Amino acid sequence: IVGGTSASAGDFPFIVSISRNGGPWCGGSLLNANTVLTAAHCVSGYAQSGFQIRAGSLSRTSGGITSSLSSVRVHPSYSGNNNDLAILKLSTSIPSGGNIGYARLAASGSDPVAGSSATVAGWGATSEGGSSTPVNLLKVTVPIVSRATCRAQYGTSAITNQMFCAGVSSGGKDSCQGDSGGPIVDSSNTLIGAVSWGNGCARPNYSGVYASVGALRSFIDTYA
């Protein structure tokens, strides 16, 4: 996360850190006791045995509850950067209680409103090309960027209705490498997307691109 601040215990009760080959890799959201929502690009085609999920901790290396994966369901039309969602089934159930809770999803057909505030969290880089990965969770608040402005930045066909954008025109606040799959929530803490892609991190006039839960609810509901 670029230009963020440390998350407080219980900020994101549903966030999970996803390690791969024992190293930092992605973020995710706990939907219920055995299901995690992440970005398809975090898991598509990789050996599932390499992954571990950690819930109930601000730290990606210790505390909370861990689980291996039982199965992975990547959106069937995942291609390029589009439809970048995957559902993970956990071999260890994670009960709600304490600092663990399940996400509340945006409504089917909802589209985040340009200008509204959204908060993204993760354990990713704190600068584009940055080396170090935080051990403790970071968060950042950015406004939603209209799809029109976003298409202005990336191209009309690069930004689909299965994506939404967020960022500051001047840059400096964004999701970065290792934040992929993690949550983006609205002002009410409703899960509206998953960190997906962008051009570098926190660049002026290059918004962060998020997989849209509202537009992909049929996929999510089929497998949650």
- What is the set of active-site residues? 41, 84, 180
CA-to-CA distance for 224 and 221, rounded, in angstroms? Answer: 5
Q: Is the dihedral of CA 103, 109, 114, 116 positive or negative?
A: negative
Q: Residue 213: left (phi > 0), alpha (psi -120 to 50), or beta? A: alpha
Q: Give the full edge-to-edge strand order of the sheet including 35-38.
A: 65-67, 51-55, 15-20, 23-32, 35-38, 86-90, 69-74
CB 213 within 8 A of CB 191: yes
CB 37 within 8 A of CB 220: yes
SS3 23: strand
CB 29 within 8 A of CB 88: no
CA-to-CA distance for 106 and 221, rounded, in angstroms? Answer: 12
CB 18 within 8 A of CB 53: yes
- Beta bridge partners, 183, equal 194
